[PDB]
Design a protein around this nucleic acid. Structure first.
Lengths: 221, 221, 221
DNA sequence: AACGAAAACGGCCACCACG
DNA sequence: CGTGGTGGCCGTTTTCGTT
């Protein structure tokens, strides 16, 4: 179980993400999906006794929001070497849906030589909206997304890593494929509300957390 | 941080625009978006110790409002050579959305040979309204705008320059992409009210400034 | 500053029209736009010490309202030779928007050989409504008007002449291009109310004037 | 008796207003 | 900002008139 670094969120998840499965967090923009991704990108490298996976991180960005400085802040919060964190995070920006899936081909071969624990795909659904904008082409983007999700599941079962994808809510296919769906909504200021909206094992429940300069971290009224 | 040349606005932004990110200023017509652009087009060339970026400026105009004389006024205000300011500002008028995006192809290659600090796109959303006026073609202009914004983010991360685009409020996609949204409204006479309407780091707050012959400059009751 | 020949209007404008810039007067029909044009067509020829520009006049008519006799009346009011006034006013009626813009080609070359101070375009927006009456052709007339306005600004900067265009209010593009917007409304009888509705330098303010056989001239209760 | 044109009705889309 | 309602425009079908 990879620690989220929010204790309340860890309790909500019973200790953190299950490696080897896809966890989807759907919420409005600015809810902190990207911030949680940046935090996990570092916490994954933490020792297992500290809630990490003792593995490198993979950040596939489609939205430009990748900040190595956020990774440095998370590393210094938990006392990890920021330089080693950036050395254990491989980053690449996907320009389109086809490029987004093509990066998985390099990811599968690269993930064999080194132990990874986390795969991050940020604005995973944005490129299927920007690229495929027509109505007759909807089935094509749905097929590409389906294949992409199957590839995610395959890599998860192959390397035993956690698969994190982010969705902006301004597909029903992900429900059966994703094991845990988390709904994120803004509480005013920088403090966010998290809700579980389906889990066969986890209750439907809510937990409050905040977005702090160092971290994605528990709410401290 | 590129100085806005309004001290109150600089305080509002904590010192000025972050280079390497897109800052959107949405407001009514005649609020001073273009005036701020003209001021920044010169202030960017200022020394870093003076709040500049020590880089050349790029003005992509779609509305005809480009005035080299305004640049000369800003240069003489801060004591910069007006001729050198015009020599460090490359200007081109986009005739359509396709031409607006096509100019980015020349911009990316040209921005490699010389250091730039500011990219200005004035009436950035006007051409998507004048060109794409139908209702069935809305998705096409939205896709073109999405690609344009992604190109802006790519150039920002590539050259570490500030990306400034102006929007007339007589898209929701820009919210996640733009880092700082500023709402501009008219105070009567030539003095304008600025408000921050989203920033993960900057407070929602307001600052009063004026539009002076020399400058975009602090309000002086 | 070209005298309007109304003292109250001159005070409203701080002495008269700035040459080298476009001044737009928007108002209802019969408010006196054409009358003001006829008056200025003669006052421009007045000595600079008398509020003129010591230059010839250019009247481009689209509405048939051109009256040389009104020019003769204005000339005799200020004591100018009516025959020389008509000799210093070149007149041409535009039959369409394309012809209206085409006349500018003859105007630019003709304005080089002799000094002019005033360019008048009467019912400037009427031909874009009579010619382009459909809804799909709106962008075409807007583009033609935009190019026409840019040509006006170019000629203004080239010859340092005043650019006067008249608009019947039974485009938002002119706002940034026009420097001074004047709203004209009828006071009953022949006495008209003038209001300034935008000027970066001139206050929003009003002045009362009348339309007299000799002149456009101050209100005399 | 057949074909073409005109008029009327219905449905869909867009814009405006209200919550 | 989103949803619902109303109005306008366009397309299709039916009926009538003319060849």
């Amino acid at each position: 179980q990879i620690t989220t670094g929010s204790k309340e969120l860890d309790k909500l998840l019973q200790g953190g993400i299950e490696t080897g499965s896809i966890t989807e967090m759907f919420g409005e923009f600015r809810t902190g999906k990207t911030q949680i991704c940046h935090t996990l990108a570092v916490t994954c490298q933490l020792p297992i006794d500290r809630g990490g996976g003792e593995g490198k991180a993979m950040y596939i960005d489609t939205e430009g929001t990748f900040r190595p400085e956020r990774l440095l802040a998370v590393a210094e919060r938990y006392g990890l070497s920021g330089s080693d964190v950036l050395d254990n995070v491989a980053y690449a920006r996907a320009f389109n849906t086809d490029h987004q899936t093509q990066l998985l081909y390099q990811a599968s071969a690269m993930m064999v030589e080194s132990r990874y624990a986390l795969l991050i795909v940020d604005s995973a659904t944005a490129l299927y909206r920007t690229d495929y904008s027509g109505r007759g082409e909807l089935s094509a983007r749905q097929m590409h997304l389906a294949r992409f999700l199957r590839m995610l599941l395959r890599l998860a079962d192959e390397f035993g890593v956690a698969v994190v994808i982010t969705n902006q809510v301004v597909g029903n296919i992900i429900a059966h494929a994703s094991t845990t769906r988390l709904y994120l909504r803004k509480g005013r200021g920088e403090t966010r509300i998290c809700k579980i909206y389906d889990s066969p094992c986890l209750p439907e429940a809510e937990a409050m957390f905040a977005i702090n300069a160092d971290g994605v971290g528990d709410a401290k009224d």
